[PDB]
Amino acid sequence: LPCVPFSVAKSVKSLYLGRMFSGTPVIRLRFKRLQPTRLVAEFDFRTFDPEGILLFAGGHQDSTWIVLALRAGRLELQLRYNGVGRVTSSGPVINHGMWQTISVEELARNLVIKVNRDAVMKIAVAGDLFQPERGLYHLNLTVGGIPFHEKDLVQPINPRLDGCMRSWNWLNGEDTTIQETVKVNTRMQCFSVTERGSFYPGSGFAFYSLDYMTWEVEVVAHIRPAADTGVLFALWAPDLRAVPLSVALVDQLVVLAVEHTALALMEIKVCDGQEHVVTVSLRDGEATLEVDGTRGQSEVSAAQLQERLAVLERHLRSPVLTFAGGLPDVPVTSAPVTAFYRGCMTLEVNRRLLDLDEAAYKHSDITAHSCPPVEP
């Protein structure tokens, strides 16, 4: 039973954009209209995620459409108008975790993108988004992704967007279907309140394919845990079914280990709901563990370290997968701790922030870019 409970509160009148595994949209709308119609869409938006797709509007792949997106915290519009594609990228920072209003609108020979009623993008275009046929005017709109493979965007992108919408309005329609069905499917609702990091409910892991070759492993982990036990970071060598390196919480301690042998331990107040910074550094003839600026005592002789680091060195010459938040059901004797992490965590490895949208594999219940607060 977890020592520190997290908030489970969801807002009923929201829409979670990151729910589908693959940047498949969470809503698809198709409009038929009887007289010429100009696109208008307006929604409120909240994310910490710096990259992904907000919406798509238009016809189809090799036709004419727009896609509004995030790249590097900022809005990016992509357009295809009769075969010719284009991208602009402008305006203020978006991924600050505060609510804000975004409007997208077709106006004369321009498209106008506004943030909090400020126009931050205005682009000239030749054509309409609605496609006349038979005196019927057609448009498709998707939220939270695009209706075709991201290969074929003007400029490729990872569309997974751990972000949130509320008070949406598409074409000033009065249809209330979206609100009604979100209401009845909590999985489609967002955390009432989000703070930064990634949340691990303790049922799975993510992994990556990272090179560490002399060689080098540095990890900084920012953690706010729910439980006193769990793997934070680890390497796993599939061919030998071994765990050449792990950093983990155990019974209240952090352990840095090579296979089964602990190299260092540091005490930690896991059960107080406070954020902590765990850093680990290893290289030829060196291994160190820090928790919040203080260093843990070595658990091994100078002689045993060289033996352990040389085994780790050997291991790094072959393929290893890098795991966050847990291990793949490994032998109990492989490593000190084999349990899943429960809680909030951000990881940076050889000085690179790990984006969980970019894992080779991410268990779908891990939220990539937000954590609910600790439960009062």
Binding site: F21, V26, R30, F31, D175, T177, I178, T181
Partner: protein, 102 residues
């Protein structure tokens, strides 16, 4: 057995009235288009808004599908018996009707 979870209501009023009818269904797999019928004729020229929501974690799982038809200015030629129709494979399903007259 009907996929329709809800069926169009009635509108009844003056020349010039504006109103809406809707229908909703739930299906397994790739969601169908919804066709509006007036006295058994599929209307090609309509003010309609169709919504598809995938319920599973996969585009092959279940979906919710809704359609809303709008009548901007009521008049005799809009009068009739309204039903939604979908094609699931070669199979067809029609909704309980709704009625518009003056």
């Amino acid at each position: 057995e009907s996929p329709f979870v809800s069926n169009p209501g009635n509108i009844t009023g003056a020349r010039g009235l504006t109103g809406t009818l809707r229908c909703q269904l739930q299906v397994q797999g790739e969601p169908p288009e919804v066709h509006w019928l007036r006295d058994g004729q599929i209307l090609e020229l309509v003010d309609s808004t169709q919504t598809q929501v995938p319920l599973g974690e996969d585009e092959q799982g279940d979906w919710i599908v809704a359609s809303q038809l709008r009548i901007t200015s009521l008049q005799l030629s809009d009068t009739g018996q309204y039903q939604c129709l979908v094609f699931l494979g070669h199979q067809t399903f029609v909704s309980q009707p709704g009625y518009v007259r003056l």
